[PDB]
Every structure is written in structure tokens, then in C-alpha cells.
Amino acid sequence: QVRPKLPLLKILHAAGAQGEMFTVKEVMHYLGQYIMVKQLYDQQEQHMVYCGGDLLGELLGRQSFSVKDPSPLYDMLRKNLVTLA
Numbered sequence: 001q002v003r004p005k006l007p008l009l010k011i012l013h014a015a016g017a018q019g020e021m022f023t024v025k026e027v028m029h030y031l032g033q034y035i036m037v038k039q040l041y042d043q044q045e046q047h048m049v050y051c052g053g054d055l056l057g058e059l060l061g062r063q064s065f066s067v068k069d070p071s072p073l074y075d076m077l078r079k080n081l082v083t084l085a
């Protein structure tokens with residue numbers, strides 16, 4: 001359903017994704033895998049993600065966010081996913 005722009009594509013590939021065409025659910029899956037395997041979540045308060053000094057933070061223009069309100073990821077996906085025909 002979607003194709004990611006370069007910085008997002010790099011993140012998904014770092015999480016084990018192949019190619020450049022994905023479903024939205026796949027993108028969400030690989031973003032979660034990325035955060036887990038790169039240990040970006042806060043170690044004591046896992047709802048928080050420290051993305052500063054990572055490509056994800058560069059892409060979001062944030063040092064941190066929380067799943068208490070994951071709106072920054074929504075904005076990023078709107079800007080970085082091309083809808084496929």
C-alpha cells in the first residue's frame with residue numbers, strides 16, 4: 001500500500017525489512033522492531049523513546065517522544081509514505 005521515502009526506508013531496512021513496497025501495518029511493525037533492536041526506548045520507562053542522536057530523531061525533529069501520544073510518528077508517516085496506486 002505504501003512506499004517509504006529515503007530516511008524512513010533506511011530505518012525500515014535497519015530493522016530487517018527488504019525492498020521498498022510495504023503495507024502500512026508492515027511499516028508499523030518494522031518501526032517497532034527498529035526501536036526495540038536499537039534500544040531506543042527508555043530503559044526504566046518504556047513508554048518513552050529517546051530518538052536523539054539517531055536517524056529516527058533526525059527524521060522526527062525530536063529528541064524524545066512517548067506512546068502516551070504518538071502523534072509525532074503519525075506526522076512523520078504522513079510526510080514519508082508515498083501512497084501506491
Ligand SMILES: COc1cccc2c(C(=O)N[C@H]3CCN(c4ccc(C)cc4)C3)c[nH]c12
Pocket residue numbers: 028029031032033035036041046047048049066067070071073074077
Ligand atoms: C520496549 O519498548 C518499546 C519497544 C518497541 C517499540 C516501542 C515504542 C514505540 O514508540 N513504538 C512505535 C512503533 C510504531 N508506533 C507507531 C505509533 C503510532 C503511529 C501512527 C505509527 C506507529 C509506535 C515505545 N516503546 C517501545
